[PDB]
Amino acid sequence: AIDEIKSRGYLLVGLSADFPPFEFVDENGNIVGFDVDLAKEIARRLGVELKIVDMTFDGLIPSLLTKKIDVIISGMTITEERKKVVAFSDPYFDAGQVIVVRKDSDFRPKTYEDLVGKTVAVQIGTTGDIEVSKYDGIKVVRFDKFTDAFLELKRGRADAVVLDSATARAFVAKNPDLVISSGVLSSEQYGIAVRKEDTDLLEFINSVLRELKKSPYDVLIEKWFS
Amino acid sequence: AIDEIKSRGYLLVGLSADFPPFEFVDENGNIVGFDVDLAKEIARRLGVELKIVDMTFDGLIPSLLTKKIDVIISGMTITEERKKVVAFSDPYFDAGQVIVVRKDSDFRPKTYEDLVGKTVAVQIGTTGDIEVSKYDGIKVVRFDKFTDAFLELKRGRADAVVLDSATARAFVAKNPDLVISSGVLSSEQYGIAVRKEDTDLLEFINSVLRELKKSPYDVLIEKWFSE
């Protein structure tokens, strides 16, 4: 696959641009997002242009098998059923919701059932909003911005926040007064998919993911512990 | 504290240079190593020279408390007892063991108990040797060099290797046929110590550590999941 991509001069990436912030159409009409940036990095490393081929999500695996695309990068969860059909890269994104509480409390909810009888702050319209709104005995307070749901928690006016894992860990890393009490709920891991026989491109992609995840701290460890 | 450091023109870092590869004395009498490289980074970013004050490990906290040094960077484990006396930075080093296995396998041990009934390669007399040798049902295969323990694993002659997280990570980075299957098996971490009153210097040190730990992936997360 790699020689054919390099000869053609562009990488064909299938996605369905109706999944912000992974892939979506911005105010300028461009397809952008977290997954699009990984696709752009892979194409740059291969020395080729990126050609996005947008289609419905259910079209992506058939397109890959028909060779109309080289790779799928589209918020695609690695599952056993998909593994029978396509090869995935190492997981590149851990999806799901978590429950955040004050570190100095005793309260350690593990599930939405543990939040019955409590006040929970969520960001309007998000998965956490939709989930907690199923539970009539949760007192739900809704915020335009997730930062203000955390501020409500910090002030003791909510008992917990529910938010996606990536965003919540990023925030809690900056706010040592909060802690993630649950595991990741409805967890999924996303993978980059490529035809089973195209193991050259698969291992190239696993190499780019490794690189993206290496920090100067990792390089320092390599310097002194090799 | 920062104004005073900059006025003086040098950062005083205390350490005990008897702990390779964290801090030790090289062939030419220079004090070098992982911790020294962190100290040099911090001094560079403050715009000052680094002045290492070498002393015995038990002398470090008293030297800090009597203001003979600005900071300790010396393989110092964060403990509740020391937290009563000094302020620590974010943890900057996980000292515990990890378990390494072949990637093309379903075997993903998480604990020493998961290695029971398996064959584990180790470097002779290291922590990993000492720790696994406690478990009766583990067949232990011992080598003078950790590289040969990994070779035993790669060759299919052992099911896993146990090694400190840092050396395992450095090796696995160049050997994608292997994976670190466990978290760190114990929770000891090193921290950079400063005086509790020196909160500007502590915040500056944390900002250096945080930036060192940021990968391009972390920056991409920040790009797409911020507000």
Number of domains in chain B: 2
CB A159 within 8 A of CB A115: yes
For residues A24 and A57, the answer to whether their CB atoms sit within 8 Å is no
Is A221 within 8 Å of B176 when comparing Cβ atoms? no
Where in the sequence is the domain holding A20, given as residue range(s)? 1-93+191-226
- Specify whether B81 is located in the same domain as B137: no
- CA angle at residue B57 from B56 to B62, to 5 degrees? 90
Chain center to CA of B140? 25
Q: Are B182 and B98 in contact (CB under 8 A)?
A: yes
First-to-last alpha carbon distance for chain A, in angstroms, is 34
How far from B81 is each of B49, B86, B197, CA to CA, in Å?
32, 9, 18
User: In terms of domains, do B174 and B197 share one?
Assistant: no
The answer to whether residues B103 and B164 belong to one domain is yes
Phi, psi of A130 (to 5 degrees): -60, -45
Interface of A with B (CB under 8 A): 21-22, 33-34, 37-38, 145-147, 164, 166-167, 170, 203, 206-207, 209-218, 220-226
Please indicate, yes or no, whether residues A5 and A54 belong to a single structural domain of this protein: yes
Same domain? For B197 and B152 the reply is no
Asked if residues B109 and B185 have their Cβ atoms less than 8 Å apart, the reply is no
Residues A108 and A20 placed together within one structural domain of the fold: no
Q: Same domain, yes or no, for B144 and B186?
A: yes
The pairing of strands B178-180 and A10-15 is unpaired
Q: Does A223 sit within 8 Å of B37, measured CB to CB?
A: yes
B183 and B214 inside one domain: no
Place of tokens 């205390």: B14
Q: Would the CA dihedral through A52, A55, A56, A60 be positive or negative? A: negative
DSSP state of B115: G
Q: What is the dihedral of CA B111, B115, B119, B125, to 10 degrees?
A: 40
Mapping DSSP onto H, E and C, the string for chain A reads: CHHHHHHHCEEEEEECCEECCCEEECCCCCEECHHHHHHHHHHHHHCCEEEEEECCHHHHHHHHHHCCCCEECCCCECCHHHHCCCEECCCCEEEEEEEEEECCCCCCCCCHHHHCCCEEEEECCCHHHHHHCCCCCCEEEEECCHHHHHHHHHCCCCCEEEEEHHHHHHHHHCCCCEEECCCCEEEEEECCEECCCCHHHHHHHHHHHHHHCCCHHHHHHHHHHC
Nearest-CA neighbor of A137 among A111, A164, A117? A117
Judge if B120 and B100 occupy the same domain: yes
Statement to judge: residues A98 and A76 lie in one domain: no
B184 and B104 together in one domain? yes
**What is the experimental resolution, given in Å to one decimal place?**
1.5
CA distance B49 to A15: 52
CB A134 within 8 A of CB A112: yes
Quick one: B68 and B121 in the same domain? Answer: no
Find, among A2, A107, A17, A117, the residue nearest to A59 by Cα.
Answer: A17
Chain B residues with CB inside 8 Å of A145's CB? 227
Distance CA B206, CA B192 (A): 9
Structure determined by: X-ray
Distance (Å, rounded) from C-alpha A107 to C-alpha A110? 10
Residue B206's CB is within 10 A of a number of other CB atoms, namely 15
